[PDB]
Each structure stands twice: as structure tokens, then as C-alpha cells.
Amino acid sequence: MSLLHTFWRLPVAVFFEPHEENVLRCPERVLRRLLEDAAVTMRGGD
Amino acid sequence: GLFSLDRSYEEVKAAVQQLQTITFRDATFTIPDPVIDQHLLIDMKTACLSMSMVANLASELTMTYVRKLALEDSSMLLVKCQELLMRLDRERVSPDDEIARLSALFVMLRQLDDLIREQVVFTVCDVSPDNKSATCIFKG
Amino acid sequence: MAAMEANIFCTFDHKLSIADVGKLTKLVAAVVPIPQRLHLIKHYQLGLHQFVDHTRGYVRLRGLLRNMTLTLMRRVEGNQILLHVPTHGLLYTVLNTGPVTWEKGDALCVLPPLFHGPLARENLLTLGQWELVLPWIVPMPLALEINQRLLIMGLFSLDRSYEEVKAAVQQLQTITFRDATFTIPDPVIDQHLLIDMKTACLSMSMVANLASELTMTYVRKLALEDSSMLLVKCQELLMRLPARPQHVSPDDEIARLSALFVMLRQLDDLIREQVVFTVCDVSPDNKSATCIFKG
């Protein structure tokens, strides 16, 4: 909940091609898939 | 003119005496106070009242339109505009009445038009001890 | 290259009749706009007809007419026309065509034509689905009213029902000025009005943010110790709600007033049309006036 604190109180609609400026778009499905793949890589990692 | 209603205090009167004296190229003069006989003349009264009315009407009217138009605004400027309006809010209608208030705002702005801008009528090119005169080109 | 032409000859690429040349002769001293200065031009590029379009917006037509070139009509010869582009500050004889009265000493502006009364007059030049629609030369107060009402229609359209906007557009359409009533044709909310709405919102918000507590509280303080029709009327337009002013600084007040003057100029330029002529004469029949050109 609200784990990010932002200086601005309103967001803006960001235009232009992703090679102009950095934007963190990622839907939750992709994030969950990435998390489990990283888990299996860590398992793959006297 | 705007200070004309607080003239019972000495702080305000010192403020007006500071407003009244003006300094320019090697000369100082005192402009006459628009308040004579303790009351402000009707033309200056209308100018001040129109200025205050346009300010007051903008303060309440602009937020409703800024929200809707900032939703669309590709300039991401109107979002910052709405943020500033939210800030000034934080520091402190029938459709025909909305039309009436918008009409009032624009009529008050037209009332300000005489003062808001003044025309240039000449531009100077001449220097002399005779400085009483100069040669200028006329502009309409 | 070629220096800009001043005297422009226009030829009609169409068989003219006697009546066409007559109603063409009546237009001497009229102001007609053209898109391109050239010594000899063709009649298709004469007037506003080339710009009327399925867009049908009045604001589009105003924006197109602003960027056109204004020229005055000179004497008519059989199937030929002479136009003269005026110079700033000189004196000229100008004919009026719209049914709007002029007065000695007022300012004039160019706006696309309105329609008046029964709209009984359309006997201008028609030549094979081409027309000579001339713009209306109107005094400043009516031009300010037109632009103001268009902007008000646009602003009110935001977040009001379709039928509410219908009723508002119906009532704001009709203008009464100098004892004659005119109606705006086709008030349409395109993008051209959307730009004006955006800058109006920004200008109002910056006015509200810049205005000081002295400026805000003047109206309230006057209402407590003065009473007049002006004050009671303007306060009836306003919301409802001694002691010393808690902050007093003339230097801050003057800096703030200067910035507010810049913003109020920004907002005024939305309704303020550019003056093209200044009048000092009227024919007592009000058909023509002698004017100083301001361009």
C-alpha cells in the first residue's frame, strides 16, 4: 500500500518513444513471471 | 486605490507614501493620491472593483475547467496548473449562473483594458542642451 | 525577388452578365481579402468562399481570415477589377456592407459574416458555384462580444449535458448591438476553440494564483462600507461568505501587479481582435466611412 512516496500529487500521461525517456511500465503478470524465473535461477546458482 | 480602505492605520499610510514617491532619470516627483476628501473617486473605484472581481471570479471558476481540460492536455502543463490550483485551495451551480459568472469575468476584463495596456506614440532621436525638445517618429 | 505588389488586377474567368458587372460596380471602396499578392490574379481567390468547407466551424473561418491579406476595391472595368493593399497610418475611404452601424471615432475589426433578421439578401456575385462572400467590418464592441460568447460557449460545454449545452448555445448565439440583432452562424467546438480554451484555463489559474489578498479582499471590504447598484449587482454575481491588513508591502504588491498585468493581457488577447481601421467620418446614410488603416 502506497509503498512509493511521490513529491507530486498528480501523475501525468507520458508521451514519446521509450528511447527518449525512461518509464517503468510493467503489468503484474510479467512481474510475477519474472519473480518466479529469478527464483529458479537462484536455485540454479565443506 | 486598493489600499484606500485600510487608511486608518499608520502602516498603510507609510505604504502609500512609499507608493506615492517615484524616481526616474535624475528626477523625483510625488504623484497625487487618488483618495481626496477621504474617499475614492468613482472611476478609480470602478477600476479597483473590476480588478478585484476578475481575481475573485477566476479563483472559483478556473478549477472546474482546469480539471476536465487537464485530463486531455497533451502539454502536461494543465496538470501542473491544476496542481497549483489545488495548492492555493489547500492554503485556505445552476447553468445559467455559470454563464452569468463567465460573462461577468470577461466584462470585468474588458473594463480593465484601458489600464492594462498603453500605446506608444513616439520614439526619440535627438539630444541637446535645448533638451526641451527632441525629434521623434510618430506611431499610431 | 519580385517586390510585393500594391495594385492588384483581378480578371473573371467566367462570362459576366450586365447585372453581374452592376452588382460588382456597387462594391467599389469595399475591403476584400486575398490569399496571395500578385499583379494579375484570378477571381477564384477573391473573398472567403474558397475557405467555406464541411468543417463549417466559425472559429476555423475566423482563424483563416486573420492570416489573409486585406485590400480595398478600386474602380471596376468590364470583366476586370482593381484592388489596392493599404499602408498603415494613411487615410482611406471605406464602404460598409454588413448591416452594422458605425459611429464617428470607433475601432473596426474583420470577422467572418454573421446573419441578420430574415437573412433575405444573397444577391451577391454567383458564377458557377462560386460566390463573393466578403467579411464583415464591425466595430470593436461587437467583435469582443462575438469572441467572448464563443469562448464562453466552449468553456461551458465542458461537463454539461448535450441538451444543456444545446440550450446554452441557443441563448449565447443571439447578440443585440446598437438596436439591431445578429446571430452567429455555426458555433462549433473544434480543436481551434480547444486551444483557446486551454489558454483561457491557464490564464485564469495564473490570475488566481498571482492575485494578492489585498486584491481579493477589496470587493469584500467595499461591500461592508459602500452600497451601489454596481456593487450589489457584481456581488450578486459572486459567492457569499474593523481589522488591520496583516501583510503590507508596496514592493511585493507592485511586482505582483506587474505579473498580473502580463497575465491579464494574455487572457484579453483571446477576445481582442486586431484593429484594421479607425473611423472618423460617417456618411449620414451610414454606407461608407473615411478611416485610418491600422495594419
- CB–CB of B81 and C201 under 8 A? yes
Among candidate residues C144, C143, C164, the one with its CA nearest the CA of residue C153:
C164
Distance (Å, whole) CA C98 – CA C113: 8
Distance (Å, whole) CA C207 – CA B55: 6
3-state class (DSSP) for residue B90: helix
Distance (Å, whole) CA B12 – CA C252: 14
Q: Are C66 and C37 in contact (CB under 8 A)?
A: no
Q: Are C94 and C277 in contact (CB under 8 A)?
A: yes
DSSP for residue B136: E
DSSP for residue B4: G
Distance (Å, whole) CA C184 – CA C156: 17
C-alpha cell at B27: 528626477
Give the CA distances from residue C217 to residues B55, B103, C100, C285, in Å, rounded to whole numbers and listed in that order.
10, 21, 41, 50
Chains touching chain A through at least 3 C-beta pairs below 8 angstroms are B
Among candidate residues C129, C125, C134, C132, the one with its CA nearest the CA of residue C16:
C125
Q: Are C196 and C270 in contact (CB under 8 A)?
A: yes
- Best of B20, B116, B120, B137 to substitute, by most chain C Cβ atoms within 10 angstroms, is B116
- CB–CB of A8 and B86 under 8 A? no
Rg (CA), chain C: 23
3-state class (DSSP) for residue A9: coil
Distance (Å, whole) CA C4 – CA C158: 45
Distance (Å, whole) CA C286 – CA C283: 5
DSSP B17-73: HHHHEEEETTEEEEPPPSEETTEE-HHHHHHHHHHHHHHHHHHHHHHHHHHHHHHH-
Helix (H) or strand (E) holding B137: strand B136-138
Q: Are B98 and C156 in contact (CB under 8 A)?
A: yes
Distance (Å, whole) CA C270 – CA C116: 25
Distance (Å, whole) CA B59 – CA C108: 33
Which residues of chain B from 20 to 39 reach within 8 Å of chain C, CB to CB? none
Give the CA distances from residue C218 to residues B49, B108, C105, C236, in Å, rounded to whole numbers and listed in that order.
7, 15, 35, 16
C-alpha cell at C219: 470587493
Q: Which long-range contacts (CB under 8 A, 24 or more apart) does B14-21 make?
A: B15/C248, B15/C249, B15/C250, B16/C250, B18/C250, B19/C250, B19/C254
- Amino acid found at C218: Y
Chains touching chain C through at least 3 C-beta pairs below 8 angstroms are B
- CB–CB of C201 and B103 under 8 A? no
List CB contacts of A43: < 8 A, sequence separation 6 or more.
none
Distance (Å, whole) CA C49 – CA C61: 10
Distance (Å, whole) CA C27 – CA C24: 6
Q: Are B79 and A9 in contact (CB under 8 A)?
A: no
Strand partners, C111: C136
Q: Which residue does chain B place closest to C90, by CA atoms?
A: B140
Q: Which residue does chain B place closest to C89, by CA atoms?
A: B140
Helix axes B42-72, B77-91, angle to 10 degrees: 120
Q: Are C141 and C101 in contact (CB under 8 A)?
A: no
DSSP chain C: -PPPPSEEEEE-SS---HHHHHHHHTTTT-EEEESS--SEEEGGGSSSGGG--TT--HHHHHHHHHTSEEEEEEEEETTEEEEEPPPTT-EEEEE--SS----TT-EEEEE---EETT-----S-BSSS-B--PPEEEEHHHHHHHHHHHHHHHHHHTTS-HHHHHHHHHHHHEEEETTEEEE-S-----HHHHHHHHHHHHHHHHHHHH--HHHHHHHHHHHHH---HHHHHHHHTS-------S---HHHHHHHHHHHHHHHHHHHHHH-PPP-EEE----TTSSEEEEEE--
Entry resolution in angstroms? 3.3
Q: Are C175 and C181 in contact (CB under 8 A)?
A: yes
Touch criterion met for C and A (3+ Cβ pairs within 8 Å) = no
**Region of C84 on the Ramachandran plot (φ > 0 left; ψ -120 to 50 alpha; else beta):** beta
CB atoms within 10 A of CB C169: 19
A8 touches B: beta carbon within 8 Å: yes
Q: Which residue does chain B place closest to A11, by CA atoms?
A: B79
Among A10, A13, A15, select the one facing B82 at the smallest CB separation. Answer: A10
- Amino acid found at B27: A
Residues of chain B neighbouring A12 (CB-CB closer than 8 A): 76, 79
Distance (Å, whole) CA C115 – CA C95: 19
Distance (Å, whole) CA B27 – CA B21: 11
Q: In what order do the strands lie in the sheet with C180-183?
A: C115-116, C180-183, C174-177
Which method, experimentally, gave rise to this model? cryo-EM
Which residues of chain B from 44 to 73 reach within 8 Å of chain C, CB to CB? 45-46, 48-49, 51-66, 68-70, 73
Exposed, middle or buried by CB within 10 Å (0-12, 13-18, 19+), for B60? Answer: middle
Residues of chain B neighbouring C242 (CB-CB closer than 8 A): 8
Give the CA distances from residue B82 to residues B41, B77, C68, C213, in Å, rounded to whole numbers and listed in that order.
38, 9, 37, 20
A12 touches B: beta carbon within 8 Å: yes
Residues of chain B neighbouring C89 (CB-CB closer than 8 A): 140
- Amino acid found at C2: A
- Interface size between A and B, measured as CB pairs under 8 A: 12
Give the CA distances from residue C36 to residues B14, B118, C10, C73, C210, in Å, rounded to whole numbers and listed in that order.
61, 33, 12, 16, 44
Distance (Å, whole) CA C73 – CA C84: 6
Residues of chain A neighbouring B85 (CB-CB closer than 8 A): none
CA B106 to chain centre: 14
- CB–CB of A8 and B76 under 8 A? no
Q: Which residue does chain A place closest to B76, by CA atoms?
A: A12
- CB–CB of B99 and C219 under 8 A? no
DSSP C236-248: HTS-------S--
Q: Which residue does chain A place closest to B80, by CA atoms?
A: A10
Distance (Å, whole) CA C57 – CA C184: 11
Distance (Å, whole) CA C29 – CA C31: 7
Q: Which residue does chain A place closest to B67, by CA atoms?
A: A10
The C-alpha angle B107, C98, C141, rounded to 5 degrees, equals: 15
The C-alpha angle C275, C194, B99, rounded to 5 degrees, equals: 80
Residues of chain B neighbouring C167 (CB-CB closer than 8 A): 95
Give break positions in chain A: residue before each, C–N beyond 2.5 Å. 45
B101 touches C: beta carbon within 8 Å: yes
B41 touches C: beta carbon within 8 Å: no
Residues of chain C neighbouring B60 (CB-CB closer than 8 A): 239
- Amino acid found at B45: K
Residues of chain B neighbouring A8 (CB-CB closer than 8 A): 83
List CB contacts of C203: < 8 A, sequence separation 6 or more.
C263, C266, C267, C270
Give the CA distances from residue B30 to residues B1, B21, B44, in Å, rounded to whole numbers and listed in that order.
16, 4, 18
Q: Are C150 and C194 in contact (CB under 8 A)?
A: no
Distance (Å, whole) CA C295 – CA C293: 6
- CB–CB of B98 and C216 under 8 A? no
Among candidate residues C176, C126, C146, C141, the one with its CA nearest the CA of residue C62:
C146
The C-alpha angle B122, B124, B126, rounded to 5 degrees, equals: 145
The residue behind cell 535624475 is B26
Q: Are B137 and B124 in contact (CB under 8 A)?
A: no
Q: Are C197 and C181 in contact (CB under 8 A)?
A: no
Exposed, middle or buried by CB within 10 Å (0-12, 13-18, 19+), for B29? Answer: exposed
CB atoms within 10 A of CB C172: 19
DSSP for residue A14: -
C-alpha cell at A12: 501525468
